[PDB]
Write a protein that holds these residues in place. Structure first.
Motif, PDB file in Angstrom:
ATOM      1  N   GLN A  34      17.112   0.147  -3.397  1.00 40.16           N
ATOM      2  CA  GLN A  34      18.498   0.682  -2.258  1.00 40.16           C
ATOM      3  C   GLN A  34      18.280   0.962  -1.024  1.00 40.16           C
ATOM      4  O   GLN A  34      18.680   1.887  -0.214  1.00 40.16           O
ATOM      5  CB  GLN A  34      19.081   1.989  -3.016  1.00 40.16           C
ATOM      6  CG  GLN A  34      20.281   2.018  -3.860  1.00 40.16           C
ATOM      7  CD  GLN A  34      20.524   0.615  -4.689  1.00 40.16           C
ATOM      8  OE1 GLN A  34      21.751   0.379  -4.820  1.00 40.16           O
ATOM      9  NE2 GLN A  34      19.495   0.057  -4.934  1.00 40.16           N
ATOM     10  N   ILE A  35      17.039   0.239  -0.519  1.00 36.23           N
ATOM     11  CA  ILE A  35      16.431   0.159   0.784  1.00 36.23           C
ATOM     12  C   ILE A  35      17.450  -0.836   1.845  1.00 36.23           C
ATOM     13  O   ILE A  35      17.645  -1.877   1.167  1.00 36.23           O
ATOM     14  CB  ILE A  35      14.922   0.020   0.974  1.00 36.23           C
ATOM     15  CG1 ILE A  35      13.991   0.674   0.082  1.00 36.23           C
ATOM     16  CG2 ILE A  35      14.387   0.097   2.394  1.00 36.23           C
ATOM     17  CD1 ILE A  35      12.894  -0.171  -0.414  1.00 36.23           C
ATOM     18  N   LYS A  36      17.898  -0.500   3.032  1.00 37.40           N
ATOM     19  CA  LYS A  36      18.643  -1.337   3.697  1.00 37.40           C
ATOM     20  C   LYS A  36      17.590  -2.366   4.575  1.00 37.40           C
ATOM     21  O   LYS A  36      16.656  -1.700   5.113  1.00 37.40           O
ATOM     22  CB  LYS A  36      19.530  -0.572   4.773  1.00 37.40           C
ATOM     23  CG  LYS A  36      21.194  -1.128   4.721  1.00 37.40           C
ATOM     24  CD  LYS A  36      21.572  -0.700   6.029  1.00 37.40           C
ATOM     25  CE  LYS A  36      22.933  -0.277   6.158  1.00 37.40           C
ATOM     26  NZ  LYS A  36      23.227   0.622   6.908  1.00 37.40           N
ATOM     27  N   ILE A  37      18.031  -3.557   4.436  1.00 39.76           N
ATOM     28  CA  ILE A  37      17.349  -4.645   4.875  1.00 39.76           C
ATOM     29  C   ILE A  37      18.041  -5.077   6.170  1.00 39.76           C
ATOM     30  O   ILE A  37      17.459  -5.279   7.055  1.00 39.76           O
ATOM     31  CB  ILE A  37      17.232  -5.773   3.887  1.00 39.76           C
ATOM     32  CG1 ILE A  37      16.128  -5.236   2.776  1.00 39.76           C
ATOM     33  CG2 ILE A  37      16.340  -6.948   4.707  1.00 39.76           C
ATOM     34  CD1 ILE A  37      15.725  -6.644   1.857  1.00 39.76           C
ATOM     35  N   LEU A  38      19.366  -5.223   5.976  1.00 36.23           N
ATOM     36  CA  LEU A  38      20.213  -5.666   7.144  1.00 36.23           C
ATOM     37  C   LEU A  38      21.733  -5.458   6.933  1.00 36.23           C
ATOM     38  O   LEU A  38      22.089  -5.544   5.550  1.00 36.23           O
ATOM     39  CB  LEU A  38      19.645  -7.061   7.578  1.00 36.23           C
ATOM     40  CG  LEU A  38      20.349  -8.445   7.707  1.00 36.23           C
ATOM     41  CD1 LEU A  38      19.452  -9.437   8.564  1.00 36.23           C
ATOM     42  CD2 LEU A  38      20.016  -8.850   5.990  1.00 36.23           C
ATOM     43  N   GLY A  39      22.465  -5.288   7.836  1.00 32.21           N
ATOM     44  CA  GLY A  39      24.047  -5.101   7.708  1.00 32.21           C
ATOM     45  C   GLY A  39      24.528  -5.400   9.011  1.00 32.21           C
ATOM     46  O   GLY A  39      23.797  -5.856  10.178  1.00 32.21           O
ATOM     47  N   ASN A  40      25.957  -5.206   9.138  1.00 29.22           N
ATOM     48  CA  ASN A  40      26.572  -5.462  10.489  1.00 29.22           C
ATOM     49  C   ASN A  40      26.993  -4.180  10.792  1.00 29.22           C
ATOM     50  O   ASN A  40      27.642  -3.439  10.000  1.00 29.22           O
ATOM     51  CB  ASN A  40      27.882  -6.628  10.265  1.00 29.22           C
ATOM     52  CG  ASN A  40      28.971  -5.751   9.766  1.00 29.22           C
ATOM     53  OD1 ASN A  40      28.658  -5.377   9.033  1.00 29.22           O
ATOM     54  ND2 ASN A  40      29.868  -5.486  10.582  1.00 29.22           N
ATOM     55  N   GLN A  41      26.973  -3.487  12.050  1.00 24.10           N
ATOM     56  CA  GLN A  41      27.232  -2.378  12.853  1.00 24.10           C
ATOM     57  C   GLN A  41      28.483  -2.918  13.596  1.00 24.10           C
ATOM     58  O   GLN A  41      28.081  -3.387  14.743  1.00 24.10           O
ATOM     59  CB  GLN A  41      26.113  -1.801  13.411  1.00 24.10           C
ATOM     60  CG  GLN A  41      26.165  -0.530  13.858  1.00 24.10           C
ATOM     61  CD  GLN A  41      25.560  -0.274  15.215  1.00 24.10           C
ATOM     62  OE1 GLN A  41      25.673   0.042  16.502  1.00 24.10           O
ATOM     63  NE2 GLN A  41      24.019  -0.251  15.013  1.00 24.10           N
ATOM     64  N   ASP A  43      16.800 -11.990   8.800  1.00 23.56           N
ATOM     65  CA  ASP A  43      17.782 -12.461   9.637  1.00 23.56           C
ATOM     66  C   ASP A  43      19.005 -12.787   8.817  1.00 23.56           C
ATOM     67  O   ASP A  43      19.168 -12.827   7.362  1.00 23.56           O
ATOM     68  CB  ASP A  43      17.456 -13.529  10.595  1.00 23.56           C
ATOM     69  CG  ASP A  43      18.061 -13.612  11.791  1.00 23.56           C
ATOM     70  OD1 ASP A  43      19.107 -12.875  12.208  1.00 23.56           O
ATOM     71  OD2 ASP A  43      17.611 -14.736  12.465  1.00 23.56           O
ATOM     72  N   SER A  44      20.013 -13.291   9.484  1.00 23.24           N
ATOM     73  CA  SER A  44      21.315 -13.613   8.868  1.00 23.24           C
ATOM     74  C   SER A  44      21.871 -14.696   9.946  1.00 23.24           C
ATOM     75  O   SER A  44      21.123 -15.074  11.095  1.00 23.24           O
ATOM     76  CB  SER A  44      22.489 -12.534   8.634  1.00 23.24           C
ATOM     77  OG  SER A  44      23.502 -13.259   8.044  1.00 23.24           O
ATOM     78  N   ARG A  45      22.923 -15.293   9.538  1.00 18.34           N
ATOM     79  CA  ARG A  45      23.609 -16.449  10.387  1.00 18.34           C
ATOM     80  C   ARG A  45      25.021 -15.781  10.738  1.00 18.34           C
ATOM     81  O   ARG A  45      25.878 -15.810   9.987  1.00 18.34           O
ATOM     82  CB  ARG A  45      23.512 -17.638   9.826  1.00 18.34           C
ATOM     83  CG  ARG A  45      24.260 -18.846  10.302  1.00 18.34           C
ATOM     84  CD  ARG A  45      23.921 -20.112   9.668  1.00 18.34           C
ATOM     85  NE  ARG A  45      22.684 -20.592   9.438  1.00 18.34           N
ATOM     86  CZ  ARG A  45      21.583 -20.451   8.848  1.00 18.34           C
ATOM     87  NH1 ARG A  45      21.539 -19.717   7.615  1.00 18.34           N
ATOM     88  NH2 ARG A  45      20.459 -20.926   9.073  1.00 18.34           N
ATOM     89  N   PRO A 100      24.490 -14.397   4.847  1.00 15.36           N
ATOM     90  CA  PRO A 100      23.282 -14.990   4.450  1.00 15.36           C
ATOM     91  C   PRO A 100      22.224 -14.094   4.831  1.00 15.36           C
ATOM     92  O   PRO A 100      22.097 -13.312   5.804  1.00 15.36           O
ATOM     93  CB  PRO A 100      23.045 -16.257   5.279  1.00 15.36           C
ATOM     94  CG  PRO A 100      23.745 -16.478   6.147  1.00 15.36           C
ATOM     95  CD  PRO A 100      25.027 -15.708   5.664  1.00 15.36           C
ATOM     96  N   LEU A 101      21.297 -14.090   3.909  1.00 13.83           N
ATOM     97  CA  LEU A 101      20.127 -13.307   4.220  1.00 13.83           C
ATOM     98  C   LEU A 101      18.884 -14.498   4.418  1.00 13.83           C
ATOM     99  O   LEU A 101      18.789 -15.142   3.389  1.00 13.83           O
ATOM    100  CB  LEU A 101      19.707 -12.298   3.209  1.00 13.83           C
ATOM    101  CG  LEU A 101      18.459 -11.113   3.578  1.00 13.83           C
ATOM    102  CD1 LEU A 101      17.439 -11.176   2.358  1.00 13.83           C
ATOM    103  CD2 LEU A 101      17.682 -11.572   4.639  1.00 13.83           C
TER     104      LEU A 101
END
Lengths: 178, 178
Positions: free
Chosen positions: B33-40, B56-58, B68-69
């Motif tokens: 449940q650790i956050k790697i990436l999201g959009n703010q 990263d992501s695209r 994508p991750l």
């Protein structure tokens, strides 16, 4: 029917996601039933399309059932419907491509006018909305123009172009020379 | 549950395709449940994950509902279940990461043995199948070994590693020095 907006000289990636045994025969065709790219067994085959050297895919995603069409160095001429045929199914994507110039340099003199023009394919008349760094905005349909450049126009402008719900944001730096 | 196989020092792209109004709040978490990436809002936020600088992501695909991750410079340590939460839904992807060495150099002498070892995460014992350029194959589970190198082993070897249906192909060039 998916509508994707690109930007002159930019790369876009049209998405295709099927529902079969991770990666099987697929190919991208243009409304004209011309083959752009497909997989041959397990390889990648691009036919003699005008998009031949600027077209690609991400070959390691097919295993996930994703068959992207990548199109580098975008031209307003690439605007068009692309069809993605993945085994039993096919996805249709409409690529609208836009350009936005500033015929003046970006380095003008206070008092001088600014003319921006949107390059669009024979298929669109969009909502151009540009803001001075000073909150003021100018809307148009192809040709924009501001009559008096203040020193309060220097900065970076944001030009929002709008189409079927979608939008492209363009950013220009104008140098208002005192 | 999607199983994606990566390769030591390689980049993989874990796919996430939702079904909502082209791009809305999403984020990648690890089984923990650790956050790697999201959009703010519209930006990209990566938390302090061990994958922080390699993740990263695209960002231009979110409009197509794809999130994508991307994970560059792959480590067997990244093996794990990644969850993709897109608004109302969530996709789970299991990333199995492998390495395959040749402890000998690749430049050996006829008659000498060849030892290849597969690096796997505590979670797998896969099907390693390597072929000499000469059709002959050797299978194993971690350690491979061929007892007599013929001049007929020079070339490029193909090591197929197999997991839940998936497979990774490794290729090694052995120089059999006369």
């Amino acid at each position: 029917k998916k509508v994707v907006l690109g930007k002159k000289g930019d790369t876009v990636e049209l998405t295709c996601t099927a529902s079969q045994k991770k990666s099987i025969q697929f190919h991208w065709k243009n409304s004209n039933q011309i083959k752009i790219l497909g997989n041959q067994g397990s390889f990648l085959t691009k036919g003699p399309s005008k998009l031949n050297d600027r077209a690609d895919s991400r070959r390691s995603l097919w295993d996930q059932g994703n068959f992207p069409l990548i199109i580098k160095n975008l031209k307003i001429e690439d605007s068009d419907t692309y069809i993605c045929e993945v085994e039993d199914q096919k996805e249709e994507v409409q690529l609208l491509v836009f350009g936005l110039t500033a015929n003046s340099d970006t380095h003008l003199l206070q008092g001088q006018s600014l003319t921006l023009t949107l390059e669009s394919p024979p298929g669109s008349s969009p909502s151009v909305q540009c803001r001075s760094p000073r909150g003021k905005n100018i809307q148009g349909g192809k040709t924009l123009s501001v009559s008096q450049l203040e020193l309060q126009d220097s900065g970076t402008w944001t030009c929002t172009v709008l189409q079927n719900q979608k939008k492209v944001e363009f950013k220009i730096d104008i140098v208002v020379l005192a």
